[PDB]
Amino acid sequence: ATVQQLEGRWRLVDSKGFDEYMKELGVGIALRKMGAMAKPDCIITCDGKNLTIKTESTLKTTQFSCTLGEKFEETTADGRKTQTVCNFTDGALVQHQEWDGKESTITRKLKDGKLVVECVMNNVTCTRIYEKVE
Ligand SMILES: O=C(O)[C@H]1CCCN1C(=O)Nc1cc(Cl)cc(Cl)c1-c1ccccc1
């Protein structure tokens, strides 16, 4: 398995736990409603150790870029400014966020042709499944 295998435009087809994850973060109701109802596309591109992940929907449209293994300032959709590191480890892209003494992890994996995105903060989890747009 390689990081290049995650490249492409992906469309959200299933979600579990995402509102609960947003509540654990303390995201306010206006943003939670947007997250519960949005069906974003995720667009992942890489070039060696360079990675970009873009999100698109009528309700919001964010993007970050990084070098694998390098700490960087990530502005999240909910407006945190985190210290983030992304690594491709044991067949998963792992995105580790730290801010204000807190931490959250997002993983992204290829399974049976689908992109599986899993989030966690303080044992509150989500699982989101995407299918390739081609
Ligand atoms: O990319 C994904 O499938 C999931 C995994 C975790 C972030 N994510 C989103 O879809 N993000 C989000 C998507 C929408 Cl429509 C709205 C918000 Cl507020 C977020 C968001 C971002 C950070 C933390 C909480 C909510």
UniProtKB/Swiss-Prot annotation:
Subcellular locations according to the entry: Cytoplasm; Nucleus; Synapse; Postsynaptic density
Keywords (A to Z) from UniProt: Acetylation, Cytoplasm, Disulfide bond, Lipid transport, Lipid-binding, Nucleus, Phosphoprotein, Secreted, Synapse, Transport
GO molecular function terms noted in the UniProt entry: fatty acid binding; identical protein binding; lipid binding; long-chain fatty acid transmembrane transporter activity; retinoic acid binding
Residue ranges the record marks as coiled coil: none
Sequence motif: Nuclear localization signal, positions: 23-33
Similarity annotation: Belongs to the calycin superfamily. Fatty-acid binding protein (FABP) family.
Domain comment as written in the entry: Forms a beta-barrel structure that accommodates the hydrophobic ligand in its interior.
Protein name: Fatty acid-binding protein 5
Organism: Homo sapiens (Human)
Annotated gene: FABP5
